Structure 1
Amino acid sequence: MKTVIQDTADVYFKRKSDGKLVFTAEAQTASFSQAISEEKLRGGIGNKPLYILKSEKEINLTVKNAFFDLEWLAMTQGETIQEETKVKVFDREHGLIVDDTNKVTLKGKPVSDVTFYNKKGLTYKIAVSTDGTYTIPTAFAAAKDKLTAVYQIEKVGRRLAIKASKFSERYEVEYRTIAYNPDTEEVYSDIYIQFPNVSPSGEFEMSLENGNALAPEIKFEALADTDTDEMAVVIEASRDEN
């Protein structure tokens, strides 16, 4: 039946090896496209077409979300997220006042050499202090000087590694959307588009800009199923025949 589609899709990804299931229900774009190669075989007196050679049917997918998820990076890289891993990150503490006896005391737990910045913009790299007390030179600051310290600390959290020779697995994807009724103006059916053998594409981009909410985007390439030789299945199951 001729129906109206005015919404986006809810997307489900599944991994073929172990069945790891991811889903997104706050998408902003879900699209797929098909392209083939055509050529004309000609001859005779007139240069008139005699045959058409068609081959290389190819299908691509693109999904663009509204929130951020590390699992999307996982699918793109074909890696795994290690939970509760210890990591070493940078930290900044600014506003330390040099005392009368040119001693500065840190309020954090450094792991590497501390670097101090004076108001003019010069650097001084000292090693870690046991009591966290540093004898700053008089040529750097004298008294009532606000200085800044940049040191590495230790943190625990999730971790994902992007290796130089690790690629992606094969997945099974499905979009779901709804189709309305032009006459009655009420939901008529549910439309499911299923791809049974896809490969995540290795090209992605992440761009952080001030005042802009990040919308990550992922791409896939659809391949023919190993036995049924399908590439995609479109289903328009209705809401009264279930």
Structure 2
Amino acid sequence: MKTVIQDTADVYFKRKSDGKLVFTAEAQTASFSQAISEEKLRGGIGNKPLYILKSEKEINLTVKNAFFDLEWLSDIYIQFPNVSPSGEFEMSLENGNALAPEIKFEALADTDTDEMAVVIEASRDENTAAPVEDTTGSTQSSDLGGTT
């Protein structure tokens, strides 16, 4: 068959503003341990009956060896409302006569919690887990390479 040997990639944390979508800076990260996990359970809506059972989709991700994460290149007091933005993702693949499937994630929050380790420095390689958010629009897209 076609020489599909592609395993690892390089993922691009893009940039959006607090109420805007600026994309100008970037905060991209290297290889992804990549527990990409689609626990989709999204459901059809019936016409006559209704149900409140568990029916929804979700996409979790994680990455490894983050870089480019300082200033995007003191009131120590946390508040309950947040207007933090959501950096869009790109994942650039390789290893084919076609170009990368170029999987884009449109709106993405950042869900990692901190953790203190006995040894030193909390990990040999850090991780940022990242869920995928939606309000009235698409959650992912695959830009198959085709030529080149």
TM-score range, shorter chain: under 0.3
Deviation for aligned residue 1:218: 18
1:29 touches 1:64 (CA, 8 Å); kept in 2? yes
1:31 touches 1:63 (CA, 8 Å); kept in 2? yes
Deviation for aligned residue 1:64: 0.8
Deviation for aligned residue 1:55: 1.3
Q: Distance in 2 between matches of 1:240 and 1:69?
A: 14
Q: Which residue does the alignment assign to 1:194?
A: 79
Q: Distance in 2 between matches of 1:40 and 1:195?
A: 29
Q: Mean Cα displacement is larger for which, 194-203 or 18-27?
A: 194-203
Q: Which residue does the alignment assign to 1:208?
A: 93
Unaligned runs of 5+ in 2: 128-148
* Aligned alpha-carbon RMSD (Å): 18.7
Identical positions, percent: 100
* Structure 1 residues 1-242: aligned runs within 5 Å: 4-17=4-17, 55-65=55-65, 69-71=69-71
Structure 1 residues 53 and 11: alpha-carbon distance in aligned structure 2, compared to 1, 3 A threshold: same
Runs of 4+ aligned structure 1 residues displaced above 4 Å come to 18-54, 189-242
1:29 touches 1:63 (CA, 8 Å); kept in 2? yes
- Alignment partner of 2:79: what SS? strand
Q: Choose 1 or 2 for highest CA Rg.
A: 1
Unaligned runs of 5+ in 1: 73-188
Structure 1 residues 202 and 232: alpha-carbon distance in aligned structure 2, compared to 1, 3 A threshold: farther
2:89 touches 2:106 (CA, 8 Å); kept in 1? no
Deviation for aligned residue 1:13: 2.0
- What TM-score, normalized to structure 2? 0.23
Q: Which has the higher strand share?
A: 1
Structure 1 residues 70 and 14: alpha-carbon distance in aligned structure 2, compared to 1, 3 A threshold: same
Q: Mean Cα displacement is larger for which, 222-231 or 15-24?
A: 222-231
1:15 touches 1:21 (CA, 8 Å); kept in 2? yes
2:14 touches 2:28 (CA, 8 Å); kept in 1? no
Structure 1 residues 212 and 63: alpha-carbon distance in aligned structure 2, compared to 1, 3 A threshold: farther
2:32 touches 2:62 (CA, 8 Å); kept in 1? yes
Deviation for aligned residue 1:6: 3.4
Deviation for aligned residue 1:54: 5.3
Structure 1 residues 193 and 39: alpha-carbon distance in aligned structure 2, compared to 1, 3 A threshold: same
Deviation for aligned residue 1:4: 2.0
- Alignment partner of 1:27: what SS? coil
1:64 touches 1:217 (CA, 8 Å); kept in 2? no
Structure 1 residues 235 and 225: alpha-carbon distance in aligned structure 2, compared to 1, 3 A threshold: farther
Deviations 1:196-227 (A, max 9, x none): 99988999999999999999999999669999
Structure 1 residues 202 and 211: alpha-carbon distance in aligned structure 2, compared to 1, 3 A threshold: same
1:9 touches 1:30 (CA, 8 Å); kept in 2? yes
